[PDB]
């Protein structure tokens, strides 16, 4: 009879963090809610990440959510959380596993890149969002810089981070709506999969400037994007048809993750053609 649906709660440590870590000044990632500093476990040398919040309702929420989320091996692990006094104020100090193999597009950006790595990547991010949605959490800021590789070792796991914007989203014949209203917060995660998938396939976003920005906003609202050659020349209608169903402008039209995750292109990611893509070249050139 089911057990390991039982995992430990979060005990918030109250001792000062510097008992346990050396807080260096290296910013790993500026991020939301403050910054993200690299720190070091004192009694094992090992490497970790700190993000600091002034304590409040919002912050207790970030911590509650990210904690529930750490279960999933594609969300970045919360190792420890401290309540400490800093400069007179209460703080939550969030100690994360340190992921240091780079940002998704950063890694891609320096090497060839195939449709198949695209799909594999997209399966991964796909699992992180399936897990959030199944325990009723919407992330709400899935973006390139929140998608990080663990090491620089070429099978690094990719992991989703930053719960600064996350919200709880809340008879065998009862319909989903009858088990209580979901707003529509859960489908921006899906738009996001869309935008990432697009970038992965070609090196640039479906919607950008021209500095052209009242024009970008229209283009977004209007859902005007396209699949220009050369980059999209060898990309199958199947793949294009998927992005179109994520980038729908009407949120109640997009696919759910369950539908995403069942798509033959994600489900059998390891069977997709290894078709060579521009992603990495477009990525060196378009740095600017």
């Amino acid at each position: 009879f089911p057990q390991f649906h039982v995992k430990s709660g979060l005990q918030i440590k109250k001792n000062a963090i510097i008992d346990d870590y050396k807080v260096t000044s290296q910013v790993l990632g500026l991020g939301i809610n403050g910054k993200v500093l690299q720190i070091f476990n004192k009694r094992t040398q090992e490497k970790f990440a700190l993000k600091m919040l002034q304590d409040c309702p919002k912050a207790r929420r970030e911590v509650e959510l990210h904690w529930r989320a750490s279960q999933c091996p594609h969300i970045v692990r919360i190792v420890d959380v401290y309540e400490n006094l800093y400069a007179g104020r209460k703080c939550l100090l969030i100690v994360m596993e340190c992921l240091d193999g780079g940002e998704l597009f950063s890694r891609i950006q320096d090497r060839a890149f195939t449709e198949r790595e695209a799909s594999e990547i997209m399966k991964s991010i796909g699992e992180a969002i399936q897990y959030l949605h199944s325990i009723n959490i919407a992330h709400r800021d899935v973006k390139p810089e929140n998608l990080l590789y663990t090491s620089k070792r070429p099978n690094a796991i990719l992991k989703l981070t930053d719960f600064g914007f996350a919200k709880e989203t809340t008879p065998y014949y009862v319909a989903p709506e009858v088990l209580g209203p979901e707003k529509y917060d859960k489908s921006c995660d899906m738009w996001s999969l869309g935008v990432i998938m697009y970038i992965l396939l070609c090196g640039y976003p479906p919607f950008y400037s021209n500095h052209i920005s009242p024009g970008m906003k229209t283009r977004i609202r209007m859902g005007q994007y396209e699949f220009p050659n050369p980059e999209w020349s060898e990309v199958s209608e199947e793949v294009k048809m998927l992005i179109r169903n994520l980038l729908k402008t009407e949120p109640t039209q997009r696919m759910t993750i369950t539908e995403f995750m069942n798509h033959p292109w994600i489900m059998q990611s390891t069977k997709v053609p290894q078709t060579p893509l521009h992603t990495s070249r477009v990525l060196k050139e378009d740095k600017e």
Copy 2:
């Protein structure tokens, strides 16, 4: 001339015993009280009775079922009485008696072990109509599940009829838009229901069940599947249909009109007579008592 005028409800105040012997045979137990066997004094016939305590939910129910009962696929209301029962005001609903049994029974003891794909379409079309009449007069039934689907008799050509309006609600220029005419998401649920029923109907078990905070997650997520053996003869078209009914976002679900114009439904008598496992699996589990 005018053939679309049907008559209003005229509640009798006369005590129901003037006309009916009220037996004690329980017949059904959903929502409010219970439905009993009763007999027409002057003619001897078999009829059903629902005990409602007057109050505002009761008056709604009678009102909607009366509008509903025009349809040949919805249990007919023969008379509504307003009587006084142990001092309390009471609405007593005399329905036609449907003694053929619930859908899944008549299906489980199908003697001739031969439930075909086609019979499934014929049933589904008939559940269709009931939902279509309902929706076309702005009622959402809101409790469409198999125990509310009963056969009139045991006759080989008995009709299927929907019952129980304990939860029914009203959902309230040639070019105007549906939105502009005036209606919340209050009626896609009937349309989910149908998906669940077709699912069971084609294979014998529900697409969603206990392992149950699980099952609730599974529903909320739309996690179901068409396992073999049972679904292996079932064509991609027919489970596209299910897919669009089981859509979790209510605005993406299909609507009865789309459903009723699906060719699998529209042209029943020309869907193949492929054997299904329904009747075996329904028989296998007296688990359906929960």
Copy 3:
């Protein structure tokens, strides 16, 4: 550096009679004001005047109509006056005069014959461009009907244009998402049900939804999303046209298509590739006429 700035609306206050002979022959007639023919005294030319009474609503009409005016598929405001009429303050909108006829009128000025499916495609592409222009600057027209779609002249290359902004309303690298940048109700998607209605008519010559006298019939048939493609009329309209109609006449506002999708549709986009197939539309239009009655 590029700068695509077009000017603002300067409401003139000088009495309009200074500028225009004002006749009384009525070109048309709106909810909120009938449309009169006028002549410019200097150039001697032919214009249309719509008379409004000053208020928030009137000023909102004018400001939207002026913005939309930039689009070559919309009837263009040429001038706006604020004058005193019968001791009432008034908004006098001057517009280009279009005397080509309403869309369906022009269609039944032919016996000849052959209104073909490609021509229909072209016509929808033209109404579609008016809706894309509007919608891309966050206006919803909201009364897109056969009777507000006017040809410029009876000449052979008259332009189809949309008019009447008396019901219109406004609204409100990067990864944000259409919602997460300002809300926005569904006033837009009804413009889109209208293209479907107009498309339906165009393809066979009678509406998808009518009162049989059965107008509670019709109200119902509309909420149901209940119509069909009868033969003989639809017998050789391709399936894809019917499916485009289906996307447009979805009863769920959020299910319907967007003009961006509409305009990217192959039957709209690659017009020159749609069959030249004859169509019962002019005949039916002509047979019917009881439209007035």
